Amino acid sequence: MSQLAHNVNLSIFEPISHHRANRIVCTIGPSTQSVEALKGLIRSGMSVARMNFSHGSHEYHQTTINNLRAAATELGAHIGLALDTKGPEIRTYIEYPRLSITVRPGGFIYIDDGVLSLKVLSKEDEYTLKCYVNNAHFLTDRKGCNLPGCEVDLPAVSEKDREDLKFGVEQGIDMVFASFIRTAEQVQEVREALGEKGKDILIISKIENHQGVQNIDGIIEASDGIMVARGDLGVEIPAEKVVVAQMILISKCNVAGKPVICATQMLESMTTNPRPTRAEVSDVANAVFNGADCVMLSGETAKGKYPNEVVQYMARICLEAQSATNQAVMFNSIKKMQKLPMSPEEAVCSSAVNSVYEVRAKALLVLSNSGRSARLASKYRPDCPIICATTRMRTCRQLTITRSVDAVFYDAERYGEDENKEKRVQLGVDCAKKKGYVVPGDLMVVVHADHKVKGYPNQTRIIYVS
Amino acid sequence: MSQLAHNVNLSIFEPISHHRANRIVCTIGPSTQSVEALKGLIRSGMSVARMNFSHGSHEYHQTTINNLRAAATELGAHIGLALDTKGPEIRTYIEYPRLSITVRPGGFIYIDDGVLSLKVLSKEDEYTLKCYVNNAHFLTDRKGCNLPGCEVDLPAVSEKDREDLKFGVEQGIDMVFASFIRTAEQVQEVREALGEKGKDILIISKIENHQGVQNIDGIIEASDGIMVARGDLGVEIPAEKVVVAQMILISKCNVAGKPVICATQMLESMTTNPRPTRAEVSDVANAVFNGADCVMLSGETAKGKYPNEVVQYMARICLEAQSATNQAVMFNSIKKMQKLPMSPEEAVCSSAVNSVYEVRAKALLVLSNSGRSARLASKYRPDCPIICATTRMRTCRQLTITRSVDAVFYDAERYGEDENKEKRVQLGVDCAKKKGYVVPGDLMVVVHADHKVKGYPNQTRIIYVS
Amino acid sequence: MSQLAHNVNLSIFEPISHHRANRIVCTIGPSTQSVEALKGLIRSGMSVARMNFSHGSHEYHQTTINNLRAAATELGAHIGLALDTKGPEIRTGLFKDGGIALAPGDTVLVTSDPAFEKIGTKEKFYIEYPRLSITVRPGGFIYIDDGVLSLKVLSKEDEYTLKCYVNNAHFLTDRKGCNLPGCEVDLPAVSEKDREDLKFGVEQGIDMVFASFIRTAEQVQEVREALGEKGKDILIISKIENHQGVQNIDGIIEASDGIMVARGDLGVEIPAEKVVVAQMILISKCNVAGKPVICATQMLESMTTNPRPTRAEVSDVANAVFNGADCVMLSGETAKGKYPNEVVQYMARICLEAQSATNQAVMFNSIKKMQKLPMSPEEAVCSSAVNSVYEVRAKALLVLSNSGRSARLASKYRPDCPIICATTRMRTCRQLTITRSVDAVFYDAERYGEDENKEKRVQLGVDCAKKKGYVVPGDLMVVVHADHKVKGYPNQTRIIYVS
Amino acid sequence: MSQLAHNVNLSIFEPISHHRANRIVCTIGPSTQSVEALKGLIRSGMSVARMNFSHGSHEYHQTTINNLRAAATELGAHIGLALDTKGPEIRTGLFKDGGIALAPGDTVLVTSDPAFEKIGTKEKFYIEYPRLSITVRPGGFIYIDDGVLSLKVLSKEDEYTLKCYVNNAHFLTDRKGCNLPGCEVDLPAVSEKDREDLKFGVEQGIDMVFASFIRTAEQVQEVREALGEKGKDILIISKIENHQGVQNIDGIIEASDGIMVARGDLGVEIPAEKVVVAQMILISKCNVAGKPVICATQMLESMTTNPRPTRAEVSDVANAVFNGADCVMLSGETAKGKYPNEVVQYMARICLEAQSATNQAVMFNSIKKMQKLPMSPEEAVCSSAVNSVYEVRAKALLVLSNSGRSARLASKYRPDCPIICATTRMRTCRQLTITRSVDAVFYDAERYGEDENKEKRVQLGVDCAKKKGYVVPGDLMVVVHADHKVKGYPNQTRIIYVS
Ligand SMILES: O=P(O)(O)OC[C@H]1O[C@@](CO)(OP(=O)(O)O)[C@@H](O)[C@@H]1O
Ligand SMILES: O=P(O)(O)OC[C@H]1O[C@@](CO)(OP(=O)(O)O)[C@@H](O)[C@@H]1O
Ligand SMILES: O=P(O)(O)OC[C@H]1O[C@@](CO)(OP(=O)(O)O)[C@@H](O)[C@@H]1O
Ligand SMILES: O=P(O)(O)OC[C@H]1O[C@@](CO)(OP(=O)(O)O)[C@@H](O)[C@@H]1O
Ligand SMILES: O=C([O-])C(=O)[O-]
Ligand SMILES: O=C([O-])C(=O)[O-]
Ligand SMILES: O=C([O-])C(=O)[O-]
Ligand SMILES: O=C([O-])C(=O)[O-]
Ligand SMILES: [K+]
Ligand SMILES: [K+]
Ligand SMILES: [K+]
Ligand SMILES: [K+]
Ligand SMILES: [Mg+2]
Ligand SMILES: [Mg+2]
Ligand SMILES: [Mg+2]
Ligand SMILES: [Mg+2]
């Protein structure tokens, strides 16, 4: 079916799957830092907690880290913990050494979330310029600002940035959202600051400016994932262009099989209102239609007054979108963008998803220790939940950004090695049952290795749940 | 190309066509009723002015009617004039006779744009019920409210409604937006109230509730077009379901070849802010990707403080979306949903668009007196402007809701009959030149009749602009 | 790609694939019965040997069976042995001199009087159809010899005999086949002679039957009864040589193990041009159904006497492969021809050419799209293995199959590489000779053990692929069998590197 | 739909379309030269008559031209008259008795000594190739008679003669064609004899040339020179009968008006199985290019002597249509056969069957998708007319064409209805006989006027469609010509109801 024919035949009043495939990121703040509120977030459907290191002492974030782990352990929940960097930020005389030998007479310097426009006339000396206020406004201390024109000469990883990432490694974060990534080598610089000790931590590059967009191929190649950081992006490039940026980045990550997060103002009005606007409901649903793994929440939960409800909405919208998607068409078009010949693992994951569609399997079970194979299954967009039986707790938590996945922990030190995969496969099936995805009689597709092969999955299996 | 492959290859930094295909509806109010402001709307890119008869005296709207015609004639602009009915509205004790024998103990009565929830417990007598306030609030006089559960026993066309439509016929409106259309026969009732004198006026049914959605096939069959009225819709059915409603209605109208308008809160935050939110930019762009002819503005221009700017944004977003669309894929999937055999006119319009793509024509020119053939060309979604040379001024104004069309008036009483079509064809070409769409050398596709045939187009032509 | 775009990009002077997927069925006869001639056909490309029980005694066919088995053993070949039944078939008797010549305008007497079986002349000769004079009325047609001889019926002479008018020149040979198309032929689906042939076939351990003139599912049912419990594992391939066969194709495929498009008779029973369409229907339907199909009769006709085929013959063969036939067949050409070996070599050369001219991934997908969801686990697994073959450009696909059920279900999805089938039944090796792409190797379980592991059969298969020159250490294979728990069907797919 | 899904839904006992789109080319010979026999072929289905200038004198062909013109006039038929050149062709001389018989093992002497032209024997005979002994060295092969006779060269005897070893039984007839595939043949692209033939053809007003052995665009260029200014409107159809022809197909199509897949020789010059692929390349490329293509040689071979074809012959013909050929051809079968009329009737019956088995909308779209954008206005218009045909299930498509350029460009897009071409040139009527779907009617402008309106030619076309039984009042047609202003090409499409 074409998109057109598909749309014409959508049911609207028949009920839907309740197994929500997409993942919701939440930013923690005053509204949501208490343990009790973190529990509400988890219950309401958060999978990842975002610490925004553009604000607050190491000590402030320590509280977040503590309260979360308290909430998550209490509820038995796996929750990605993410550290979002300050980056080469610019706040306010304004904080930017090379400001004058960097910005042209004629260009633009927007301030305070893009609201205040200013045009440059000439250079006064080595410090500042004299400019032209294009619309009136009032202007707090310490407000963020963009230089759409010039490419900024601040470092990808500042000194504060080293101290933050170091603190992050020490607290065992699961992933990094690196603000303002412009190139592949900047990604490499984040990788370095993390060092040997932080080498198993996911870097999600935030694309926030012109150059990030231009270098997307390279950044994707070097990162574990992308965030479409639309706040800054919408100020750095014309507002309407962001729509195209979002489509490009989401689809390229989809082809690359790397998680991608859509961010910023998705349900903005819910910062203060019980109900979202019509535009906002549609934004969330369309980020899912674009192929986004994750949709994110910022102000809405950091400092909003409806943090449970806003997440509940987000979850409800994702479910609806998910059910209005022709998922087999997604699977297929992704398959078609892959080079032949595939590696054996990739052909296996691709083919397992094929089987899922062929037998209408109710669950897909994959053994992954690093998450590689989980992400490789999810890359192919099956219409069912992916159970991942994993030996690492870090993997459970990192897999919270990947569409469709519920991770289950096999404690190998306690229960044995499981060379023949039987204990892990059993653990996965029980998980699928416990969660209501399957019952005896249903078909499952299972992915792992045969007896000989080590270091990747090379086998698919179709089994009947007992 | 798949959607996926398409998205991966979008340019973002190359420039685009500036011939905007989609149309922008504006609601007139305190911010926009003066002649000078109406001129700004026209300049900023309004094509249709919406009078909201849910508020204001006949005398208030008379001002609007006058100021508009003053602005439009001054600027030489063609502007659809639309009358949006009060309908079976409910404001506030609440205004609804059969309220108690109509609503169940257990159902819901939301009030004031969906904000205030109330659950029904039992029946007191023949007047009112006693209910349960689910969230606190403050509650002005005269606030609109919905009954999601029951199907309302108010008339499709009330008495006020007759007086309004009668006033509308007398003022020569171009089209009607009928609130709360639930069935085909309700459409028929609007048609009756309009009478013989109003028989050439377009009825655009507003879909705003459960039943409208269920009966869409029938309503489309009976109407000239649809509006996705998402304000009321988002309160009558679960918020997230509107996303699906929008997709169904837009595509069905697209298959039916009838104009469709997407409405309500598209750039809401711009009621007060100079910049739209990220969610709002995306809403507008996605309504264009859905296949909407028109996107609409309500509060944003009725009572907003940035009415020019908000329209300018809307126009800029439409252009971007339009340019990121695979328009040939749209053309094709529409063609494929039509029954064989087509009528000759339809095969002609379909085929002209085919030629447009084949020779990359820069303009498509069609002679239509009623608009039939204009709408029939636009149905097939060419990637160029459609010039329509028409003999009726009412047609120019009604064609303002149809994608891609610029209408040009041939004054037949003044200039002659033009049986061989030469004067009208010349008029159309000059129009395309005047507007910068073509220059000598370019190819145009032209649609009208051969010398013999009367009452529809049966001929296509490919010509070189001199 | 579309068919058009595909064609304009075909190469003609580039190398082609070396591994022939289609299979060749050879009819045995004077030219071909000796052990030596059999070795000849095997080396030349024969996968299947067809005994035509329309000629010869049981003893005659015993010679064929013995010689075939001796030649196959010398060469270490699996060769399917097929018994093609007489059916409800009307043949002529014998002619004085072993031949008679007929001229347009002439009359002749056609009789069912058995007295005249041996002594056919210009003036009277015998056809074996006792109810001739009741069945074919004046103004009817009797066709003879692949329908090349046209006779019109003038009158009934007596209880035995019709007077006929000769329409065209022909030289008539002993015991030709006749067609009465405008007619209800009063004849058993399975005659007494047929039951004996079949029973004989069962004792002699044939692999498959080619059942002539199959009209209905019920008749397939009859042949199945006739093989009995003892013969239950023998494949039945139904021959579609008439109107009703084509009409009832869906049911005949249901009941059957396979289909032969028997074009000789079919081209006389129905207008000649409609054979083209029936050929396309039967092949594609067998493909969709996953049952082997064979295209037969006159494919390389002129090589009965000539060391090279006509241009028409060559494209007939290629198009049969393009249509999607598993097998193409020979008749005249191997039974009594002058070039039994070269005609086979030509057929195999034409198959390979067409094979490599095919867009095989598109075949595969076509077939997939025509199957109901949900699939059985077996079918998803096989379908998906083949999917994996294309994704990794695998050099061979190995499937463990005892019945052959799983091998046929793999081959169903039309991979573009050899399929190895490790089988624990010798008979299955031989029955898989009519299935595109399959090479079978035998695993002697009695002599080597249960192999619940599957390792021994997997190794055997890999080694078979190596011996055949399909793979070397480093190459990817796709392997299909069951996990440790599941019995009765495959539920597992592995992609391995060849050690 | 996919090819598979299409097939499984083909019907075989449902009615078929009645309006034959493909065209039949008949070679004239003894069997067919009389006026009466010509009327015979015309009524039977011949659209084109091929003179083979490899046999017969100018006077002989004059008889053919005259008889054809007399028969076409009696019947009011447009028949394309084609001159098929000798080319750089090597034929044998004459044999005593008009035939000789050769046995495997034998030697024979093959000589280029003209003394031996008339007197060929078992022991020595003549082939017309003066440079024989230089060109074909020991251990080479000489093939004769559609490459059925195989001789190996042993030694050179003298300046004229080679000793050869006979590979197989054959009965050799006077003046057969020879192939030296392993060889540079020292022969003119256009001999002196050729220039005269062509010049003769030009005076006699032939419609088209079938140019033998065309190797390069330059050689097409040579034939064009040879026709001169006077012959500039004659169509050149290049025959691809060798390696270089296939190799240089893209350039030969550029230079040519069309292509014949001449399979007789081609099947000897290149491995027999590769003809299948060359056939698919040439046809599809001509389709993409919008130039007519003909498939030739041995299509219905056995009907030279038999009143019905073989199963192979029938599918050869159908598959040529499926491939997308405009025309299929006859040779032996009409020139010297016993059933000139029935062989044509069979061919037309097979064409129609295959035509109706085709998914014609899919042909059309394939071809569209293979064209560069932007198209010329002409091409968009024609492409879009055909588009309209499918959309309204039109009963006929009318196009005004004087050169035939626009008719060929309409037919290019493979509508599934008759195309009427109103033309002001009698020659165009006759040249359009090799273009699928076209029926031409003649508009006598000198006698009826300028018709800048187009009304007179539009009416003429509609009336032609009525006479032919394609349309009645009420039916939809699609009509293609120019608006009032544009000259030199069509830029306009109309859908009308037939009054
Ligand atoms: O952790 P990743 O890289 O996803 O790989 C996991 C895969 O490797 C294997 C084989 O080595 O792991 P395991 O050894 O835990 O059984 C597969 O069974 C499993 O699917
Ligand atoms: O006004 P609608 O119904 O679109 O029909 C207009 C069509 O009818 C015709 C023919 O009657 O109008 P007109 O008579 O003005 O020339 C066509 O030329 C024209 O395209
Ligand atoms: O014999 P068929 O029906 O083809 O099925 C064979 C399949 O069954 C299984 C399991 O029963 O056989 P086996 O037990 O011989 O190993 C699979 O391994 C094998 O692929
Ligand atoms: O002769 P060709 O090149 O086919 O083109 C003929 C076309 O040119 C035109 C216009 O020149 O011919 P005509 O002037 O004879 O009417 C079209 O009407 C006609 O369809
Ligand atoms: O960093 C962000 O999330 C942004 O600016 O959108
Ligand atoms: O009527 C409307 O426009 C609405 O409620 O959305
Ligand atoms: O028996 C056959 O094979 C036939 O009739 O073609
Ligand atoms: O000349 C021919 O037609 C041939 O060689 O096939
Ligand atoms: K940050
Ligand atoms: K209203
Ligand atoms: K038989
Ligand atoms: K010739
Ligand atoms: Mg940012
Ligand atoms: Mg409303
Ligand atoms: Mg038979
Ligand atoms: Mg030749």
Numbering used by the authors:
A (entry chain A), B (entry chain A): 1 to 92, 126 to 499
C (entry chain B), D (entry chain B): 1 to 499
Text of the article:
Pyruvate kinase (PYK, EC 2.7.1.40) catalyses the final step in glycolysis, namely the transfer of a phospho group from phosphoenolpyruvate (PEP) to ADP to form pyruvate and ATP. PYK exists primarily as a homotetramer with subunits of 50–60 kDa (depending on species), each of which is composed of four domains: the N-terminal (not present in bacteria), A-, B- and C-domains. The active site is nestled between the A- and B-domains and is located approximately 39 Å from the effector site which is located in the C-domain. Trypanosomatid PYKs are allosterically activated by micromolar concentrations of fructose 2,6-bisphosphate (F26BP), instead of F16BP which is effective only at millimolar concentrations.
Single crystals of TcPYK or TcPYK complexed with F26BP, Mg2+ and oxalate (there was no evidence of ATP from the crystal structure) were obtained at 277 K by vapour diffusion using the hanging drop technique. In the R-state structure (TcPYK-F26BP-OX-Mg), the active and effector sites are occupied by Mg2+-oxalate and F26BP, respectively. A superposition of the T- and R-state tetramers shows that the T- to R-state transition involves a rigid body rotation of subunits (excluding B-domains; AC cores), whereby the subunits pivot 8° around a region (residues 430–433) located at the base of the αβ barrel of domain A. In the TcPYK-F26BP-OX-Mg structure, the 2′- and 6′-phospho groups of the F26BP molecule form a series of hydrogen bonds similar to those of F16BP in the human M2PYK-F16BP-OX-Mg structure, although the furanose ring adopts a significantly different pose. Pro490 in Trypanosoma PYKs (replaced by a threonine in the M2PYK-OX-F16BP structure) stacks with the furanose ring of F26BP positioning the 3′-OH and 4′-OH groups for hydrogen bond formation via the backbone nitrogen of Ala482 and the carbonyl of Leu390, respectively. The 1′-CH2OH group of F26BP forms a hydrogen bond via the backbone nitrogen of Gly488, stabilizing the effector loop conformation. The conformation of the effector loop is further stabilized through a series of stacking interactions (Trp482, Pro517, Arg516, Trp515 and Phe521). These subtly different effector interactions in the two structures result in different conformations of effector loop: in the TcPYK structure the 1′-CH2OH group prevents the effector loop from folding up around F26BP and stabilizes the loop in a position that favours the formation of an inter-chain salt bridge (Asp483…Arg494) across the C–C interface, an interaction essential for allosteric control. Previous site-directed mutational studies on LmPYK have shown that the increased stability is the result of a series of stabilizing salt bridges formed across the C–C tetramer interface. These interactions are also observed in the TcPYK-F26BP-OX-Mg structure, indicating a similar mechanism of regulation.
